[PDB]
């Protein structure tokens, strides 16, 4: 309407700023990587864990800088949580996802429980200022914001309440449907390198003058459309850039020196937004190891 995307998202994140720093005392706990699900559904229930706007850190066993342990948990239980198979979610024609109507038949009646668990970790999400590709049918967005759409409907007050107790529907009520999907997986806009080149932070030796970043950016300069997507996915594990930019991707971007060793693969750390790049000096090098690196991620 009146006021455009842009500028209430500028309000949206001000907001949780001020409440981020009215509450400072964190949260402190343990979750095995193959039991992910089932562990963070006990250790974050509200019984255990009220507050979820309070700073949580995560000790993954798998039998990294804290708020990138942190993120990977959240994003890898997110993916698990709202997984078809989980029996929470499942998907339209196209993979749009919304509440299972047999999730009772299928999970019995703690069902609204785990909706009211999801919510929570969505809501996190978005206060914690992480994209995550949760593509979500609009009428499950809508429902949230306020006919055979009321089979689910004490699937949509639990997962709203749970949304609430992070960030407040009010705040939320600023905003579209489709703007909704914008905050959770970012705009459906081309890759802007201008823009990432902008606000790309540079380790462990490089800068932006560096022989190494000169020839990647030539190198990604040439990529399609598709392969800047690509490429976006495989560093921060999000294929869109966030609304406002790479200016508001926490953490930036980031270029890292590899070794010198000229066999070892361009790897990622998504939680931090991280490419760990090798010394390459010539463009044919670092473009098929690069495009390599990418296409094993697949």
């Known amino acids: 309407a009146a006021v ?7 309000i949206f994140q001000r ?42 850190r995560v000790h993954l066993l798998n039998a990294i800088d804290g708020g990138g342990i942190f993120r990977e948990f959240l994003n890898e239980l997110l993916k698990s949580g709202f997984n078809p198979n989980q029996g929470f979610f499942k998907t339209t024609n196209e993979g749009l996802l919304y509440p299972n109507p047999a999730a009772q ?16 970790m969505l809501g996190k999400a978005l206060y914690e200022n992480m994209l ?28 709203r309440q749970g ?13 579209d449907q489709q703007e909704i999907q914008v905050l959770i997986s ?24 560096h022989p190494v970043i000169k020839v990647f950016w030539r190198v990604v300069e040439g990529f399609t459309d598709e392969e800047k997507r690509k490429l976006l996915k495989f560093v921060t594990s999000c294929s869109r850039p966030p609304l406002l930019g ?20 361009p790897t990622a750390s998504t939680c931090m937004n991280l490419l760990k790049l090798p010394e390459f000096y010539d463009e044919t090098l670092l473009r098929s190891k690069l495009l390599y690196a990418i296409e094993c991620a697949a």
Not at 22 to 50: C, F, M, W
Not at 163 to 175: C, D, I, K, Q, Y
């Open 186 to 209: 970012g705009a459906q806009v081309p890759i802007s390198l201008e823009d990432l080149k902008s606000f790309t932070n540079y380790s462990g030796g490089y800068s932006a003058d």
């Open 132 to 159: 995550v590709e949760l593509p979500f049918a609009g009428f499950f967005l809508s429902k949230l914001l306020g006919r055979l759409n009321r089979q689910i409907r004490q699937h949509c007050l639990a997962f």
């Open 163 to 175: 949304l609430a107790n992070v960030v407040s529907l009010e705040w939320l009520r600023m905003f």
């Open 15 to 56: 907001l949780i700023y001020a409440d981020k720093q009215e509450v400072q005392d964190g949260i402190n706990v343990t979750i095995r990587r193959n039991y992910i699900y089932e562990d963070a559904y006990d250790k974050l229930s509200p019984e255990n864990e009220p507050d979820l706007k309070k700073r949580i």
């Open 246 to 265: 790479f200016k508001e991707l926490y953490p930036a971007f980031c270029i890292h020196n590899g070794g010198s060793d000229l066999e070892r693969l």
């Open 105 to 120: 038949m299928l999970v019995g009646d703690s069902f609204a429980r785990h909706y009211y668990f999801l919510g929570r």
């Open 4 to 10: 455009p995307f842009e500028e209430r998202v500028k």
